[PDB]
Design a protein around this ligand. Structure first.
Ligand SMILES: CCn1c(=O)n([C@H]2CCCN(c3nccc(-c4cc5ccccc5o4)n3)C2)c2ccccc21
Ligand SMILES: CCn1c(=O)n([C@H]2CCCN(c3nccc(-c4cc5ccccc5o4)n3)C2)c2ccccc21
Lengths: 544, 549
């Protein structure tokens, strides 16, 4: 463990120097610009902020250092920032004036490769291996006048919806220090959620944009896998295509997500990565005020919603009805199958071998729970345990069996079943003539170190990675003391360890944000955002 | 497994040939009725109309949908006699004739379908006994879209057994012949389409392409074809022998007599109907302005891929169009995608046979193996340890044979992930190479002239020109530019190939005796750039064969 300790010492020194540099830069600017109303600057919605930047009312310098100062401050309570992207102060002066994001500071999840910086993923083997170019989406952000300013924290190896690693440590929810910020885009959740960044980028293969957005009370969108460029993204495993990885915006309101999506969906992106279909942002779809046919469920019969989740869902259902929309009961078929064999088997087709190679000689962060221990088990023993667990705890047994290695032949079979399943859900959708789908979103935030032990609770998010449908979340309410007290009546549908842990983990959540999930068909990001906009306007009208 | 024999397969063959026989009878009887009520009709004038003029006269009302339908039906019946390209007549197509939407962009246009395009009440056998007597419950997506656009799908066309071949014979419907020379292959796997369209029997067809199956038969039969990016069009309802293989993408696209026809078909397909019926297809409309552009192009080119030695006719075809593109004011830049042997031998072969051909072999249990497949089935049936041994023994003297054999072994899911990442990195590599030379498009030789019957299955290396772009998933189209001269053909006596292995030897003999046969060039653009690829194809056609415009 000498190698791993050395990596942790190096990374913490780098993080400390980053924060110091940040601190000195903001102190210098504040003293040189004492009359600047920093509070008003920071409370500006992004759209108003960009219009002031475009007109020249606010300088890019003013916006930048004010946000840097705020980022530095919120980090003290959250530990969300791993790295200051030092060269940003010169990109600031060079920002293209006609750019749609001119002078907008943007936070980046650590896996977004940035020249001269590590993308560690909390892994020793990636420490001291800086990237030698910006990833594609970073290049286009810069060409649109945006200024990426920080790298934000992720759970070790990024397969966790908590947010801790042995290198930069544990990220905390800004609303409550004992709560997880979610993950794997947890640092983004904490930074944006506390006001330290107006716009961020995250990734999602099982919920990693949506979890931290919901837990930290911000908006996030997970597009169709290939709507945006993955070129230059750092990951633990490459070449897994059964369950689609996506990247997308995270922000304080829906309009910010739409703006970022529009800015990204430009000639620069389509030229820099020709593999991405050149689908322009269709403004006509996003701005539509036509009444919607909205499918909805208030439970997936897999993860029992918290009282706060259920109320959030019913209330927005009611408000959408009152607004003239048609609400139709709808549940994607065969959810247990889609999670237990398709999703779990898609993510772990090789039994976790590729994934495990990253952990050789490294600490295993507590927030990952028993994942690594389980994956290390021999395939015969996984099968054996699965057979024994099945009569008593079928959820655990199904996952365990699906986390075994298989042949290329069996992968083809799985990929085909994923295609057929996607077809089946599309057919259901069509048969009910839906435009859109409203679902619950896992919340309120779980206690630190519990997401790793409540695996079933990914049911609400991972389904739409498997299906590869655009899915976003919007904050709609907060946990009342009434909601929180009702957790004592929560039993889950199965009563296995996942239910038991989840019950405990969702307690003590008064005042915490609670979200709802919005889904559309593949390539319909604009329609998904149109529906997110509607939810936002109805449930939280002050946001618009 | 117990040997089950061939009795079931034989019953399938006699049943399938009867369905074929009855189809052609029904066709002939329908056109005879029509001709007896229309002695006035100038058949050969209507048949010689370029598709665009044909659709225009259909739209104005100058020609009736009945007139063009029965005239083409009669021509299709006639050209089939010497080609054996039709497997089935889509019997309910006269009701689509009367239901055809008058505002549809393909109103009254008869369209030929490769057998794998599932059509309600009809088998999609793939020449495989186990798919005989298994009628499709519905039209596939693209067929629905064609009908919604007013087209009249009228025939299913032949394929080599299982479609994993660029010849065109199966044990059910037999062998399809090149219309230019009965001893020659029409190409494949869209061979029926090649033979039918190339002899005037259909103004527009649909085929598929995972290794060259649109481009081969188009080039061999002297027509144009386009292989789009894999997911530019819908694969929903397409009959295949293997499902779940996603390393090397399958594509579908048009085949016709001119590039303008290809562009019309793509435009008609790329509509709300398609994007609704299959939401997995990105809703990318046909970009008219890109297709119609007349700006000078930066054209990359190569005379050879250093893997398959071009025929003298291939090489001349490439140089001539290179020179005429330069004379028309474009800049031609020497360009060869890096690491082609890797792309073919490990990426393409490995991607197509990741499971060692196991899934593929299930389709052949109890069935005849068509001779046009060569030793493919025999090789795939070999145990993994034995393929390995042979590969190691073959390596020093015959590296091509060794690498293909090794890559056709089964592997783990772990190794497939690694391979899928390698294909993705290779795609970014060639894209960066392309960008650093600032190319617009890429000019490539296209395999030709047509190989003798039963030789494509024995000259596997020759897929190098086409499958490279399935591996890269770039749009790639093909256009006829010249014919084999006596001088081109005589120079085959000097043909050696780069490797001198069995594949080169077979190809040398297979390309001889081709005087007068059509030879093509291949046009390539970046992913999702179908309109630009068509723009370039239009240019090549205009300069090499101006009468077609
Ligand atoms: C949204 C973030 N995210 C996840 O939450 N996951 C999940 C997916 C399913 C397995 N997973 C997990 N983790 C910890 C423990 C177990 C576990 C299984 C088990 C079977 C019997 C008995 C006990 C058990 O624990 N499983 C991690 C991701 C996987 C890849 C990438 C991102 C991921
Ligand atoms: C365009 C049509 N098409 C093909 O041509 N193929 C090829 C691909 C490579 C293997 N292939 C083939 N076929 C016959 C023989 C061999 C052969 C291999 C070998 C190794 C050592 C020694 C001798 C040998 O022969 N290989 C068929 C397709 C594969 C999937 C789908 C369509 C295909």
């Amino acid at each position: 463990r000498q190698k791993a300790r050395g990596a942790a010492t190096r990374a913490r020194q780098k993080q400390r120097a980053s924060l110091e540099t940040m601190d000195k830069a903001v102190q210098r600017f504040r003293l040189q610009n004492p009359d600047l109303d920093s509070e008003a600057l920071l409370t500006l919605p992004l759209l108003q902020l960009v219009q002031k930047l475009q007109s020249g009312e606010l300088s890019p310098e003013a916006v930048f250092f004010t946000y840097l100062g705020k980022a530095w401050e919120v980090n003290k309570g959250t530990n969300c920032v791993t790295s200051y992207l030092t060269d940003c102060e010169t990109q600031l002066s060079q920002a293209p004036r006609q750019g749609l994001l001119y002078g907008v500071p943007v936070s980046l999840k650590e896996c977004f490769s940035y020249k001269g910086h590590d993308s560690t993923l909390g892994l020793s083997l990636n420490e001291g291996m800086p990237s030698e170019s910006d990833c594609v989406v970073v290049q286009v952000l810069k060409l649109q006048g945006a200024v990426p300013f920080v790298h934000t924290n992720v759970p070790q190896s990024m397969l966790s919806f908590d947010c801790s690693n042995p290198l930069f440590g544990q990220t905390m929810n800004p609303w409550k220090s004992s709560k997880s910020p979610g993950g794997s885009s947890g640092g983004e959740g904490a930074l944006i959620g506390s006001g330290g960044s107006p716009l961020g980028l995250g990734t999602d293969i099982g919920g990693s944009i949506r979890f931290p957005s919901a837990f930290c009370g911000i908006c996030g969108l997970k597009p169709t896998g290939n709507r945006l460029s993955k070129s230059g993204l750092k990951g633990c495993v490459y070449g897994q295509t059964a369950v689609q990885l996506s990247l997308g915006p995270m922000a304080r309101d829906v309009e910010s997500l739409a703006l970022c999506l529009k800015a990204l969906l430009c000639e620069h992106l389509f030229t820099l990565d020709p593999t991405v279909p050149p689908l322009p942002f269709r403004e006509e779809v996003y701005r539509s005020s036509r009444p919607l046919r909205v499918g909805y469920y208030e439970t997936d019969n897999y993860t029992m919603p918290s009282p706060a989740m259920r109320r959030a869902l019913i209330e927005t259902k009611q408000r959408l009805e009152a607004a003239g929309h048609t609400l139709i009961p709808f549940l994607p078929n065969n959810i247990p199958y889609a999670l237990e064999v398709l999703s779990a088997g898609g993510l772990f087709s090789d039994g976790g071998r590729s994934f495990l190679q990253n952990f050789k000689g490294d600490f295993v962060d507590p927030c990952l729970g028993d994942l690594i221990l389980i994956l290390r088990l021999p395939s015969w023993f996984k099968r054996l345990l699965s057979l024994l667990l099945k009569p008593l705890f079928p959820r655990l047994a199904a996952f365990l069996n699906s986390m075994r290695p298989r042949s290329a032949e069996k992968l083809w079979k799985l990929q085909h079943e994923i295609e057929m399943y996607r077809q089946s859900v599309i057919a259901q959708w069509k048969a009910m003539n839906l435009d859109v789908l409203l679902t619950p979103m896992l919340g309120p935030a779980l206690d630190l170190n519990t997401p790793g032990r409540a695996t079933g609770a990914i049911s609400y998010t991972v389904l739409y990675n498997c299906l590869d449908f655009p899915a976003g979340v919007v904050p709609v309410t907060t946990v009342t003391a009434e909601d929180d007290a009702q957790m004592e009546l929560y039993k889950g549908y199965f009563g296995d360890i996942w239910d038991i842990i989840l019950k405990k983990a969702m307690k003590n959540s008064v005042g915490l944000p609670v979200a709802v999930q919005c889904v559309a068909l593949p390539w319909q990001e604009e329609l998904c955002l149109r529906f997110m906009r509607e939810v936002e306007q109805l449930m939280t009208p002050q946001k618009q």
